[PDB]
């Protein structure tokens, strides 16, 4: 499913991401859009032979379990398939756990680069959140 | 999922790819094998954009939908996470239009240079089917 931008913060929203470890919901809205352009099937493969798979590009490496990354784990306990559901639960509740990992949301590199320090407030716009 | 050998001829022959358009069960898992490695969550980028998916490394371009090939069909009706699903009826129900669509097995490119004119039936050797 490719969600629209208001569309995605209100899921967002009401599964816990707005200023979940402080940050605010455009982050997470601007961190989708540039991750994958809010399409949940949205799949990249990394050199490492790891893929990212999602929403939010969540890494095989770590994250979720694939079954060809070798030598990966499976922190957020889901196959990675589930990180491309029309549904974004899986994809929030790894998220969660992602940002808490020290990193905060430095662990997507698109947010770093492109939404960090930027104004975020802007992707929730027009949104009747 | 990454299926067992004989465990995905099994699924295959329950949902009637055995001598599907004329090829033997063998062939299918052969061509399984080679595609995806029995993996069910197996995806490919190919340059051109569109993805191939699933145990069968079913493609983008014509078959299914990832909202991300431009200017590609979705002919067999589907989301292409579906064919990444631990259960193989979308992906084998997409096979059949797939291999009646004029090339037979032709169309997986690791079918034809690695199966075909081989000794397709020692991939169901142990197998009690
Ligand atoms: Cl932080
Ligand atoms: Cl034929
Ligand atoms: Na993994
Ligand atoms: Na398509």
Same mark, same amino acid.
Request: positive net charge; charged residues 20%; proline residues 2%.
């Given at each position: 499913?490719?969600?629209?931008?208001? +569309?995605?913060?209100?899921?967002?929203?009401?599964?816990?991401? /707005? &200023?979940?470890?402080?940050?605010?919901?455009? #982050?997470?809205? @601007?961190? =989708?859009?540039? +991750?994958? &352009?809010?399409?949940? !099937? =949205?799949? &990249?493969?990394?050199?490492?032979?790891?893929? /990212?798979?999602?929403?939010? !590009?969540?890494?095989?490496?770590?994250?979720? #379990? /694939?079954?060809?990354? *070798?030598?990966?784990?499976?922190? @957020?306990?889901? *196959?990675? %398939?589930?990180?491309? %559901?029309?549904?974004?639960?899986?994809?929030?509740?790894?998220?969660?756990?992602?940002?808490? /990992?020290?990193?905060?949301? #430095? =662990?997507?590199?698109?947010?770093? #680069?492109?939404?960090?320090?930027?104004?975020? !407030?802007?992707?929730?716009?027009? @949104?009747?959140?």
């Amino acid at each position: 499913k490719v969600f629209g931008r208001c +569309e995605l913060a209100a899921a967002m929203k009401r599964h816990g991401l /707005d &200023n979940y470890r402080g940050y605010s919901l455009g #982050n997470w809205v @601007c961190a =989708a859009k540039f +991750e994958s &352009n809010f399409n949940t !099937q =949205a799949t &990249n493969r990394n050199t490492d032979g790891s893929t /990212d798979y999602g929403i939010l !590009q969540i890494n095989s490496r770590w994250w979720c #379990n /694939d079954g060809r990354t *070798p030598g990966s784990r499976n922190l @957020c306990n889901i *196959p990675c %398939s589930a990180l491309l %559901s029309s549904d974004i639960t899986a994809s929030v509740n790894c998220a969660k756990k992602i940002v808490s /990992d020290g990193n905060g949301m #430095n =662990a997507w590199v698109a947010w770093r #680069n492109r939404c960090k320090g930027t104004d975020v !407030q802007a992707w929730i716009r027009g @949104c009747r959140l």
